[PDB]
């Protein structure tokens, strides 16, 4: 449903401190800020609470730079294009080389 | 939730022809028409399928204009006032006169 800024959810708010930014905020402890202007760019942030506890393309909050690359399948790839490519939600997404 | 017309939701569109005006219409055979500028007026259409079975405000739909001041009770009252206030939702809202 096309909505109206701000919104208060189900625990998370969402709203716009100026014409150029849009801030979702979560209880659980994620705070997405998004850049509209020129372009957008994300800057998620996460509390300390969740060390070692996510995984994705942000990895998994554990301090370690070395097992950010990890796959789901629990090996650690050379590249970041194959890491990058197992995290597609779409079979028809190209492989990224 | 806050939305922006046209909407297309279950059994209802609701769009706007004008700056002026609102209409939504349903699968039931009912259309409103809602008139913003300068005051706010309804129009309500309704759809011959439904003749002798609505109730309210509108009449019964029976095209006996005898009966259209019969509230739920089952008796016809004698001033407009008296079967209006018969369909208040709320028991704080006065009594009209
Ligand atoms: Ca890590
Ligand atoms: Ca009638």
Same mark, same amino acid.
């Given at each position: 449903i096309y909505t109206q800024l701000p919104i208060s959810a189900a625990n998370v708010t969402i709203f716009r401190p100026s014409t150029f930014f849009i801030i979702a905020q979560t209880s659980l402890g994620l705070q997405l800020n998004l850049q509209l202007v020129p372009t957008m760019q994300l800057f998620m942030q996460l509390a300390p609470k969740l060390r070692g506890q996510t995984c994705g393309?942000?990895?998994? &909050?554990?301090?370690?730079? @070395?097992?950010?690359?990890?796959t789901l399948s629990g090996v650690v790839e050379a590249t970041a294009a194959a890491f990058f490519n197992? &995290?597609?939600?779409?079979? @028809?997404c190209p492989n990224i080389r």
């Open positions: 393309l942000c990895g998994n &909050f554990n301090s370690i730079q @070395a097992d950010d690359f990890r197992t &995290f597609k939600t779409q079979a @028809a």
